[model samples]
Target chain A: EPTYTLYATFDNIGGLKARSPVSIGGVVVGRVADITLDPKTYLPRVTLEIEQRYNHIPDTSSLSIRTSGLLGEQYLALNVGFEDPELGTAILKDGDTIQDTKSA
Target chain B: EPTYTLYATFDNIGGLKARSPVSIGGVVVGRVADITLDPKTYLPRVTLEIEQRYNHIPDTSSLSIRTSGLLGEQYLALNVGFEDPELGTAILKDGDTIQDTKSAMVLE
Candidate 1:
């Protein structure tokens, strides 16, 4: 099993004040490891860790930024692809389009 | 201001054990008040309470159950509308469509 890392930038830092859950298919698979500001771009940078067992996510898998409860903390959410081939340690590139859904 | 309550049934009771925050535009407006089993249906029923100010959710506003942190507890969440009209005490009817998202774990 190999772990994978993903990065995200939050427009509203307050939106993600603490570590949030990362899940695929309503099941937890990882977590936000750390959050900081990019010294060069002055943007919020979020680092995510995915378990080695789930490191084989599809290349076409998408990510969503979601919340728990209406006003709960924000975290990265994963949506796996059934058709695309597995993705190894290769990181999800920056500026990757992320979908937004209601946080419940 | 008047408070409003909304109810939801969960397929897996383990899916919702404790209270989850409710948010709109990333702002928390309420919380899961309680979770219980419906004696007749045997399904997990989740009750939510919305702040009086936000009680006017639109008819089109959606609800989703979400988790915090990885392996975190589950709770009912709310989504408001920018286009639809305000919804008063007339509760959001049961069997209403809901959206699902990722789950996370938390310390608290």
Candidate 2:
């Protein structure tokens, strides 16, 4: 099965490192592939490798850094927007950049 | 009483609005002055008015959007990095920008 790559830039990603899980409403759908710095903004640009099977995520979705429990592990939280069949699915694709990103 | 102005931007603020409290470890240290959109990124830019008495806050600190309780009002949570007198205080000044930010968690 193939996976897709998406990018999200954040001002800060505290305690979130490479190999972090990317989950959608508590369900794991992807993983963090890379963490690089944007030269212009000097912020962290995170790369996500999402499984092909979980490709229903919408492009209008938002990503946020989340922590588990109290001082536990940190992961990426994905929040999706509307997806209407008649209108559009608004599904995300590979090599897409997620502009709606929240940091931790 | 004097207050200093600071700015912080975020992708989403959730239920946060103007007049929200900016707290540090559960203590209110400031108030959210205003909220506007950044023309460059089209993101939410928050204006914070911190009390001058809380000048010990470090610049390396981070801010996170936090809620009161389950389905409660949201506010800003500030976390400090370091405060050593021997070394540098690294205090945040007026008109400074906070690069670190987290969105308020929403329950499904």
Candidate 3:
């Protein structure tokens, strides 16, 4: 399946590196495409390549850097935020940046 | 007078950079020497060069990244923890890493 790219700014990324896994609901939905420092904020900007099949990710969703075990590698975990049907929630699009980010 | 180095690990440095001032109680006591990532915790490790005059800093002291003004540059602030003389507090050493840290306050 094709993937869409999304950006996220973090205060700190810990040991998160490029090509890391992006998990959603206990499933692998994508991988980290790239990582860079945002000159304006002086923070790390992470690029996520999420699979198209999981395109329902809501705008309010959050992202966090996670460690699998005590000495495990880090990965990005997406917490799909609740979408209020009656209120009309917006689905994230390509080039959208996730504002809610948790540091590792 | 001489200066000694100290280390502090933080979850987020938040625009903190090298050569940034390290202040204690509104006074400049040191400078941030460098910043790196901790392989074990995967957090930012901040190296501080503190003047020997402020050698009495308590081990329980906390470090925080601060901004000078509403649109000011970032720096490190050392919160000197109160020393209960009865309990006998340990002074921070040349290479001690401060464990407690508060990330920079990002304005919404």
DockQ of each candidate, alpha-carbon based: 0.04, 0.03, 0.05
lDDT per residue (tens digit) for residues A1-104 in model 2: 58899999999999999999886544466899999999999999999998887666778888989875443578997776655678766778999988899886
Candidate 1: regions farther than 4 A off: A1-15, A18-104, B81-108
Candidate with the larger lDDT of 1 and 2: 2
Q: Counting only residues 3 or more apart in sequence or on different chains, how many pairs clash (N, Cα, C under 3 Å) in candidate 2? A: 0
Worst 10 residues of 3 chain B by lDDT: B36-45
Interface C-alpha RMSD per candidate, 1 decimal: 10.4, 10.1, 15.4
RMSD of each: 13.1, 15.3, 13.6
What is the per-residue lDDT of model 1 for residues A4-103, given as tens digits with 9 covering 90 to 100? 6766555433355445777886688877777665434434566777777765565556666666666566666677655533544433442232332222
Q: What is the lDDT for A43 in model 3? A: 95
Model 3 lDDT per residue over A25-101, tens place: 32467899899999888999999999876777789899988765445578887877877899796989999999999
True contacts kept of each: 0.03, 0.00, 0.00
How much lDDT does candidate 2 score? 0.81
TM-score winner between candidates 1 and 3: 3
Query: Model 1, residue B27: what's the lDDT?
Result: 48
Top TM-score hit: 3
